[PDB]
Design a protein around this ligand. Structure first.
Ligand code: CL
Ligand code: MG
Lengths: 243, 111, 231, 241, 235, 244, 240, 195, 250
């Protein structure tokens, strides 16, 4: 054997074990989710409070690309940052040449091709993050989830991290119970609940909730963080549902 | 054709005493026959008890002072906060100026 | 085991052993403590010597008039990273006439350390850093790890037996955070914190290294007889 | 045995990395099929959307390379998209340099030559995909050309790709033995699509709903994919016969 | 094999740690810093009696105010010295002044870790950089291939280092004269050296503010050796 | 990374030998024997073709003997393809020298440069060495007739008579036995063929399994002529000496 | 470019590639250097398994770097040519800029620097060569003899040998060479050099090369008969 | 720089070269040797642009000396001249060409013949019985056309050369401060000290 | 990133073998039989068209390729390697010859260029050798007709007739019996079809056999008229119909 010792090597199955090993690093990370709604998307993430010494609200994990795209990820946090930095360069060159802000599907492939490129050579390591991202463009709302292999799809709801199965099960219920659609303000509240429910798989340390959102009506198509009253309202909603 | 230089006028003056030294300069800034500013300082405190002025083409003057001020900053970092002596500052400025020997800073410099 | 030959290789459980071995170099390094209030931020560093004839390895480095760090691990790597910070702080000043935010400083270090963990040939940085600073949003303290992970904190400690100081600061959190407009008391809290990581040795005059930055205080380092006040 | 890790010869003259890239082809467990009409070329592929959270409209293995050329992939989506983007860039450049639309067979050769390079150069791995290019070429007429990880390529009267490719292949072989011709003798593309689906149903032995299939159609001066309702309309026609 | 810039599980660079073993095999070099000057002494260690010992150059001038002694793979030191000399002279050209001993040492140590896959391996030589400047006075530095440098009051490197360092620990005090330091280096060298110490197989040097860096003659060192033996027999 | 698959072609063994050079020499020892013999009035180059097939086109073939310029020729032993790379370089080097100095290149200079190229592949670059040994036969107005040999190590030496390729041990003993300094070309021609005839792994030495060449001053007055022997000319010289 | 670090440290603190390059030197034919009162002599072994050689055209073991300095060697022959070429170029470059020929120490220091560079440069192996560099500085009558080796270290020698069985001839030179009184004349210096090679060589026929260098660019190589006379004289005195 | 002459006779080549080095309205030196020995039996005189002349001459000198050491053999005058021409032929299409004109006087030991080559800064080589560069030629060529014979001795060649220098001293506008004469023959290169 | 494989993947083993070349030759052995026969007034090159599937159109896949108007090539081994070699061979004929001399290269020199390319894959960094043996048939004014074999090592040999690939051992023995130096082109084509039938197992007709010749100039295939010196390509690919005609009188 030894097929797993080098990246970009096919096993006799037809698998790249190094990418599957990177997935294990993603599975190890904290829970992050994405919820598509009527006229936008909502992102949320679990921030494990390792210590009392962590400053609240000042270790921001959700990142913005351009002015209309939000990105969140689980796994090796630095790898995620590297991917977003690239995303920002890709979005900047698109706007520079084509004037219009980069569409979400276009942006999705830019990250997709870049992550896929890191499975082509043994001189690079695959990304140790699954990245949930999306936003609002001319064609409306889009939510995506990108994996270490470079594989991505459009989603109604997306989840990754240690509590992905708990979050997925909860996401599947929303899709079934709301066929006509979920509103932006609703999706924010649901996102809080799902992070709290997904926290049961990581319940040693208590956590800090962080939510962001793009919405054509609520945020005017721009990415904004959910803060203050709207955040506390979503936290209270989630606290009420676990009990 | 594009002329990269200009003349911002003004004048400067340096005199040395026994235990002191002065560097003076008028605060007028001009182009051609127009006044740009009646108060635009061009004599600067660069730290380590060194005062500097690069009079002539103001863009090159400001760029040079900026670089020398930055040179003083890194002299501290690289040499354990040692004070940059006036003779060492002079020699450092020679290299800044001569570095652009074939596209000069159009300035009369005094420290 | 078979997956620690270089940084470009993942283990079957999804671990980067070279990054973890670099992390191990920090644990071997001498203890250093960071803590802040709302007005000031303080670094306290236990310096280490080769023997009684040798000098004590300088742990604290200045980056700008408003920012600097303390190191634990490979000192040459700290020099590279501190030099990079100095340039980024300086780029911000010359180009934008703007003091570099301590948060951006951390983001820049994270991204620089990350590139070394994903490429063949290179190696991770073998040092941990505690960056303090005072900017437009008040006092700050960062903890840099060579995995790339940067973390903003009220207080922390890295190095050998850093768990003693880190537990102390976790208890003292409510006290030292409100030491506003008082440098000497914030330092005392830091000197008392680093004392919890001491074994057999005690804080002497050429052993202790303290730095401070704040509202009306440029980043300045205290060594030798200047720290005798706090022993 | 490092001769199995990179693209160099084994003692028996084999490239194991190429062979294992072929096995990655069936990792998606999807079967494709391509047939030619008189005026058109129809390609169909299974569409399996297992997760309920997926947006089914974004799940696709058929690509519009140029206005005239279409491409379906058998293999993982990351390599599929890698091959698609490159093919698009090649087809665009070809038009700019030589002043006419890139032919289906020429693109297939170009992508095959790229695939060949990965089998000879060590630092590049082969893509774990089989690319099936379809068009109505202005010179050669309806065309099906297929590329694999070995860098092999060839034109087809019809073809199939996937896990149950052999069953589909023989099903088509037996039809062309019977019909005695190189294509589907049919006027409209609508009925060529109906033929394609019908023969896939017989070979695989499964029934299809509108969301179980994905259809691409190449006509003169344009290639286009069919919507769920376009396929549903097509499935109704088969059922009522 | 394995990467050149690889970390061990304990958190050390293999190649740096292995280069330290090469330095232990090297000939002894001792440095002692006083308020009257810094003394540098080395074991020459001629591999054969036919080798002309005065051609063994293990003590070296970097500038008039900075000297340098070496131990280990001494061939590797040539480019380090060349860099140090250029750094010293270049700084004088840019700033019309002598360069600080620490700044010089730091410049040399920057080369140390510029290896990987830049040069192919670390240096296999340790340097004792002694000098004087107006700011920090007389200084002795130990520059390693790890890129690290420590300032020392006294330091021994090479094969007899750990034995000599323990001896320097006892003997050194802050009021040593230059003459006392000269004898102390000779004394400690004679202890750790394999062959019997004389003017031909051991070399002394010093750096003073007034006269700068000076390598001693074999005539001058011989008198210090004779002065040393008499003083040890005298009690 | 790629380190895993590096053979490290340019390293020393514990004994102080270059693995790849030693193995390239092992390769060359299976190649068809080539013999060079230097006489006082010319040089002979003789070489055995590697197990010939009856359908091989013999007259329009070049495997062993190549022409570098009008005055210098080489006999090859090893990989033909490798040799041709080096030959084209050597041909160019000769023309560069002529263009620079308006004089034909001295034999040793050409040999040294070609040998220096081989040396480079054993010390740096991480590539395999050229699996080739040359016998250089040439003439210049300084040293007159000269024989040299170079091998994959890049080491070259001068000879009066020398063999490369297969059975050099047996061939060199036979040459050392019958060679003498006042020898003529026609005698050297006979010695070369007699040596090959005994050291050959074939049943009997024939014209179709041989390449032959002479560098004489047999032209008209103080000028050198290269003669690459035709199949019929090898057939005649083989009968003339009484081997067939 | 090929980047691999071939010369690297081992756990015990050895660079094996440099040490294996020394083994190549140990395999090479013996070379000896003996400096007298007003001259230096470079003796060289030539192995006698090679008959049918052409000694006119065969590369000589001793090479002139300039008109006043010479270089002999032991080890890989192909490697030595590269060092000799570089040294010859540097010799002319020094005359061009300094307006003065190289000193023997300077030339040695250069050659040694080249050897060292190949011990910590990526993609290259060390030179499998040790050199003896001898000559006289410009306008100087003091003899100079230096040695270099693959690692890059160099040093001056009153007399020295390198190559195969060099430890035997070094043993001989160590007792036979007096520092207080070196070979006063050319004859004495050549004889001592030939004697030292006769401990190792085999026969004193075409196995020994002798090159004598004297001040002011006075270098000459001895012929077979000239060397054979020393061999004949030494053997007759030996039978006693 | 300015005046460089060359006369090939029966058994030798004779090169005369002016001693004056003028800049502006000042003769800075009146004992300048405008020549370099490329090899024991090859001498090159030079004239042209300030700095370029010596820089080029010494660069050629180094290359020929390097060749001599490498091969332990002296290049023929023909070979040296061809090397020099090629260097000037490269130079002329460089960013900044060498503005140097040269005469190469050599004695070929293999042929036992003197050889004089005239090469200008463009890389225009010609073998001649007599040569000159600059304005000198406008007087000396016609003079030598008349008085030169191919079978002359070295002494006759020197008298023929004196006749040129006298004519140049009479009719040339500038004071070139006499000439340094050198003879190249079978025994090598030597300088005539009283001219 | 970047091609870090700057070292040879083909190296000498202790026994003196070049492993990757030997293994490339093993790949050629597995390949389908192709052959070449040289006549007095022409050359014939032939091979079996092994169809990957009956749905595949074997006309689109050309095993016999035109390199120049007077030179053609066929192979045994790995088709993809062959295809890129033809592309490079066609280009090198222009860049390294026709754009310099204003005429097409002679067979031996084009062969030499192809051999160089294949030799470089045997020694250059980060590449395996080509897994093919080429048979190149061609004509030029001063050398006449010629037939060359080019192996993975980069070695090339001129042949009167030969075969490579699957049943080359038997095919070469067959050609030895039939070949003489007085063969006319039509007699060589006849022998080629006989030799090839031995190695072919399934169908044997113009659709499963690919065959081309280097013979007389073809003015009809030139595409233009008016230049007397330009007389048309000597390379001609025999049609499916033309092969079947000769199979009846077999
Ligand atoms: Cl292509
Ligand atoms: Mg002219």
């Amino acid at each position: 054997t030894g097929y797993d010792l080098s990246n970009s090597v096919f096993s006799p199955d037809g698998r790249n074990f190094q990418v599957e090993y990177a997935v294990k690093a993603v599975e190890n990370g904290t829970t992050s989710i994405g919820i598509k709604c009527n006229d936008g998307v909502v992102f949320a993430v679990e921030k494990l409070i390792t210590s009392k010494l962590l400053v609240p609200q000042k270790n921001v994990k959700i990142q913005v690309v351009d002015r209309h795209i939000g990105c969140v990820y689980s796994g090796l946090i630095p790898d995620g940052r590297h991917l977003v930095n690239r995303g920002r360069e890709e979005a900047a060159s698109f706007k520079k040449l084509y004037k219009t802000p980069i569409p979400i599907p276009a942006f999705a492939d830019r990250l997709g091709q870049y992550v896929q490129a890191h499975t082509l050579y043994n001189s690079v390591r695959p990304f140790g993050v699954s990245t949930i991202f999306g936003g609002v463009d001319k064609n409306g709302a889009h939510l995506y989830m990108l994996e270490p292999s470079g594989s991505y799809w459009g989603y109604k709801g997306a989840a990754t991290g240690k509590g992905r199965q708990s979050a997925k099960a909860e996401l599947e219920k929303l899709v079934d119970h709301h066929p006509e659609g979920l509103s932006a303000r609703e999706a924010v509240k649901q996102a809080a609940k799902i992070i709290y429910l997904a926290h049961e798989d990581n319940k040693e340390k208590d956590f800090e909730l962080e939510i962001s959102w793009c919405s054509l009506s609520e945020t005017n198509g721009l990415h904004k963080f959910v803060k203050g009253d709207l955040l506390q309202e979503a936290i209270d909603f989630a606290q009420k549902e676990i009990n | 054709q594009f002329n990269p230089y200009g003349d911002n006028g003004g004048t400067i003056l340096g005199i040395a005493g026994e235990d002191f030294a002065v560097l003076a300069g008028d605060t007028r800034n001009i182009t051609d026959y127009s006044i740009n500013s009646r108060y635009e300082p061009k004599v600067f405190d660069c730290g380590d008890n060194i005062v500097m002025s690069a009079n002539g083409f103001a863009a090159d003057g400001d760029a040079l002072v900026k670089r020398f001020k930055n040179s003083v900053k890194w002299y501290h970092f690289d040499h354990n906060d040692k004070k940059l002596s006036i003779n060492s500052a002079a020699r450092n400025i020679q290299h800044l100026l001569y570095g652009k020997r074939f596209f000069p800073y159009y300035v009369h410099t005094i420290i | 085991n078979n997956y620690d030959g270089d940084t470009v290789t993942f283990s079957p459980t999804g671990r980067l052993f070279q990054v973890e071995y670099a992390l191990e170099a920090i644990k071997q390094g001498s203890v250093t403590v960071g803590l802040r209030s709302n007005t000031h931020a303080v670094l306290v560093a236990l310096k280490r010597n080769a023997d009684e004839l040798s000098s004590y390895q300088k742990k604290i480095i200045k980056c700008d008039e408003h920012m600097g760090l303390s190191l634990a691990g490979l000192a040459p790597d700290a020099r590279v990273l501190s030099n990079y910070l100095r340039q980024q702080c300086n780029y911000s000043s010359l180009v934008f006439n703007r003091k570099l935010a301590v948060e951006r400083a951390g983001h820049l270090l994270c991204d620089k350390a990350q590139k070394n963990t994903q490429s063949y040939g290179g190696r991770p940085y073998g040092v941990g850093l505690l960056i303090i600073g005072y900017d437009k949003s008040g006092a700050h303290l960062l903890e840099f790890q060579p995995s790339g992970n940067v973390t903003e904190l009220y207080g922390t400690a890295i190095g050998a037996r850093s768990q003693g100081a880190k537990t102390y600061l976790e208890r003292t959190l409510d006290t030292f955070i409100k030491i506003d407009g008082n440098p000497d008391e914030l330092i005392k809290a830091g000197v008392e914190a680093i004392s919890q990581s001491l074994r057999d040795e005690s804080l002497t005059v050429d052993n202790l290294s303290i730095a401070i930055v704040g509202k009306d205080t440029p980043f300045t380092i205290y060594d030798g007889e200047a720290v005798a006040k706090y022993i | 045995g490092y001769d199995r890790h990179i693209t160099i010869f084994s003692p028996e003259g084999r490239l194991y990395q190429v062979e294992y890239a072929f096995k990655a082809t069936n990792q998606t467990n999807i079967n494709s099929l391509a047939v030619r009409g008189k005026d058109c070329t129809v390609v169909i592929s299974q569409k399996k959307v297992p997760d309920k959270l997926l947006d089914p409209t974004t799940v696709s293995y058929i690509f519009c390379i140029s206005r005239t050329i279409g491409m379906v992939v058998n293999g993982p989506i990351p390599d599929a998209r890698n091959a698609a983007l490159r093919a698009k860039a090649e087809a665009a450049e070809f038009r700019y340099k030589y002043g006419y639309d890139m032919p289906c067979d020429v693109l297939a050769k170009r992508m095959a030559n790229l695939s060949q390079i990965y089998t000879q150069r060590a630092y590049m791995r082969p893509l774990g995909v089989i690319l099936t290019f379809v068009s109505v070429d202005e010179e050669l007429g309806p065309s099906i050309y297929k590329t694999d990880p070995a860098g092999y390529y060839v034109g087809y009267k019809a073809t199939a790709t996937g896990p149950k490719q052999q069953e589909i292949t023989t099903n088509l072989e037996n039809h062309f033995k019977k019909s005695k011709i190189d294509h589907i003798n049919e006027e409209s593309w609508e009925k060529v699509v109906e033929f394609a689906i019908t023969h896939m149903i017989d070979a695989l032995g499964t029934e299809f709903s509108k969301n179980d299939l994905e259809v691409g159609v190449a006509t003169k001066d344009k290639f286009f994919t069919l919507s769920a309702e376009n396929i549903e309309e097509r499935l109704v026609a088969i059922a009522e016969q | 094999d394995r990467g050149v810039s690889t970390f061990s599980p304990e958190g050390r660079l293999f190649q740096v740690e292995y280069s330290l073993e090469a330095i232990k095999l090297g000939s002894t070099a001792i440095g002692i810093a006083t308020k009257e000057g810094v003394v540098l002494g080395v074991e020459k260690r001629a591999t054969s009696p036919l080798l002309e010992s005065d051609s063994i150059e293990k003590i070296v001038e970097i500038d008039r105010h900075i000297g340098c002694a070496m131990s280990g793979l001494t061939a590797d030191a040539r480019s380090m010295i060349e860099h140090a000399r250029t750094a010293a002279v270049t700084h004088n050209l840019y700033y019309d002044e002598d360069i600080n001993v620490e700044s010089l040492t730091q410049s040399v140590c920057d080369l140390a870790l510029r290896f990987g896959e830049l040069m192919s391996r670390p240096f296999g030589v340790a340097l004792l950089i002694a000098g004087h400047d107006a700011d920090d006075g007389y200084q002795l530095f130990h520059a390693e291939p790890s890129g690290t440098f420590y300032r020392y009051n006294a330091k021994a490197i090479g094969s007899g280092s750990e034995g000599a360092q323990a001896e320097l620990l006892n003997e050194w005090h802050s009021s040593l004269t230059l003459k006392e330091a000269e004898l102390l280096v000779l004394k400690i060298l004679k202890q750790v050296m394999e062959e019997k110490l004389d003017e031909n197989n051991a070399q002394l040097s010093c750096i003073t503010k007034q006269d700068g860096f000076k390598i001693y003659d074999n005539e001058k060192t011989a008198e210090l050796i004779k002065e040393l033996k008499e003083k040890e027999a005298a009690e | 990374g790629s380190r895993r698959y590096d053979s490290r072609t340019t390293i020393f063994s514990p004994e102080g030998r270059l693995y790849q050079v030693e193995y390239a020499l092992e390769s060359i020892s299976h190649a068809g024997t080539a013999i060079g013999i230097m006489a006082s009035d010319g040089i002979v180059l003789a070489a055995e073709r590697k197990v010939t097939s009856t359908l091989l086109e013999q007259d329009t073939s070049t495997e062993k003997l190549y022409k570098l310029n009008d005055k210098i020729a080489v006999a090859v032993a090893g990989l033909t393809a490798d040799a041709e790379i080096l030959i084209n370089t050597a041909r160019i080097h000769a023309q560069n020298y002529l263009k620079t100095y308006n004089e034909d290149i001295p034999v040793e200079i050409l040999v040294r440069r070609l040998s220096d190229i081989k040396q480079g592949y054993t010390q740096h670059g991480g590539l395999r060495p050229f699996g080739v040994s040359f016998i250089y036969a040439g003439y210049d107005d300084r040293y007159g007739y000269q024989l040299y040999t170079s091998n994959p190590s890049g080491n070259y030496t001068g000879w009066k008579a020398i063999s490369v390729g297969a059975n050099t041990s047996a061939a060199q003993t036979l040459l050392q036995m019958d060679y003498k300094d006042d020898m003529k070309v026609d005698d050297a021609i006979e010695l070369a063929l007699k040596t090959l005839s005994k050291t050959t792994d074939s049943s009997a030495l024939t014209y179709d399994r041989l390449e032959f060449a002479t560098i004489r001053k047999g032209a008209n007055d103080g000028e050198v002529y290269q003669k690459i022997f035709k199949p019929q000319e090898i057939k005649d010289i083989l009968v003339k000496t009484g081997i067939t | 470019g090929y980047d691999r670090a071939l010369s690297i440290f081992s756990p015990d603190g050895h660079i094996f590639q440099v040490e294996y390059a020394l083994e190549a030197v140990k395999r090479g034919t013996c070379a000896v250097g003996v400096k007298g009162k007003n001259c230096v002599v470079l003796g060289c072994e030539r192995r006698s398994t090679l008959k049918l050689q052409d000694t006119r055209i065969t590369p000589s073991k001793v090479s002139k770097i300039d008109s006043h300095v010479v270089l002999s060697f032991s080890g890989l022959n192909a490697d030595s040519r590269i060092l000799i070429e570089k040294a010859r170029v540097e010799a002319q470059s020094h005359r061009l800029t300094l307006e003065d020929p190289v000193t023997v120490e300077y030339l040695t220091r250069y050659v040694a620097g080249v050897q060292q560079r190949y011990t910590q440069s990526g993609g290259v192996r060390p030179f499998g060569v040790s050199t003896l560099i001898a000559g006289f500085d410009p306008r100087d009558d003091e003899p100079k003899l230096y040695q270099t080796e693959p690692s890059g270290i160099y040093s001056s020698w009153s007399a020295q040998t390198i190559g195969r069985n060099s430890k035997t001839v070094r043993e001989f030179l160590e007792k036979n060479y007096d520092r207080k009184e070196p070979p006063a004349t050319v004859e004495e210096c050549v004889k001592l050099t030939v004697r030292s090679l006769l401990e190792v060589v085999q026969t004193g026929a075409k196995n020994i090369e002798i090159t004598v260098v004297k001040p002011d660019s006075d270098i000459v190589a001895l012929s077979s008969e000239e060397i054979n006379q020393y061999v004949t004289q030494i053997e007759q005195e030996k039978q006693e | 720089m300015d005046i460089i002459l060359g006369i090939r006779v029966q058994d030798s080549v004779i090169l005369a070269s002016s001693k004056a080095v003028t800049r502006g309205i000042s003769v800075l030196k009146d004992s300048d040797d405008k020549t370099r020995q490329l090899s024991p039996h090859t001498l090159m005189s030079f004239a042209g642009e300030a700095g370029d002349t010596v820089q080029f001459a010494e660069y050629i000198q180094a290359n020929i000396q390097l060749y001599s050491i490498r091969e332990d053999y002296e290049l023929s005058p023909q070979a040296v001249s061809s090397f020099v021409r090629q260097e000037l032929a490269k130079s002329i299409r460089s960013r900044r060409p060498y503005q140097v004109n040269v005469l190469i006087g050599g004695y070929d030991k293999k042929k036992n013949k003197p050889e004089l080559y005239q090469i200008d800064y463009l890389g225009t080589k010609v073998e001649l019985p007599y040569g000159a560069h600059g304005y000198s030629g406008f007087y000396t060529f016609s003079l030598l056309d008349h008085h030169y014979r191919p079978d002359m001795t070295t002494e006759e060649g020197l008298d023929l050369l004196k006749l040129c220098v006298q004519e140049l001293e009479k009719r040339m506008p500038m004071d070139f401060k006499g000439v340094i004469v050198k003879i190249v023959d079978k025994d090598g290169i030597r300088q005539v000290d009283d001219f | 990133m970047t091609d870090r494989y700057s070292f040879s993947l083909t190296t000498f083993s202790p026994s003196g073998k070049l492993g990757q070349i030997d293994y490339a030759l093993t790949a050629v052995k597995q390949g389908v039989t192709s052959l070449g026969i040289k006549a007095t007034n022409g050359v014939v090159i032939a091979t079996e068209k092994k169809s990957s599937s009956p749905l595949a159109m074997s006309e689109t896949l050309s095993k016999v390729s035109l390199l120049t108007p007077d030179i053609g090539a066929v192979y045994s081994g790995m088709g993809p390697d062959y295809r890129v070699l033809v592309d490079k061979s066609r280009k090198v004929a222009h860049t390294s010859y026709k754009r310099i001399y204003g005429e097409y290269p002679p067979t031996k020199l084009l062969v030499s260029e192809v051999a160089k390319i294949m030799q470089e894959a045997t020694q250059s960094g980060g590449v395996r050798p080509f897994g093919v043996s080429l048979l190149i048939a061609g004509h030029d004014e001063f050398n006449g007709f010629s037939l060359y074999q080019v192996d993975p090592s980069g070695s090339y040999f001129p042949w009167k007739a030969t075969a490579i690939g699957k049943g080359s051992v038997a095919a070469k023995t067959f050609l030895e019996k039939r070949w003489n130096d007085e063969l006319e082109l039509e007699d060589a084509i006849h022998i080629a079809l006989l030799t090839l039938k031995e190695s072919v197992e399934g169908e044997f007709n113009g659709d499963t056999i690919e065959l081309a010749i280097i013979g007389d100039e073809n003015p009809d295939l030139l595409g233009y008229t008016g230049i007397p010196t330009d007389k048309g390509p000597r390379f001609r690919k025999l049609t499916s119909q033309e092969i079947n005609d000769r199979l009846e009188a077999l």
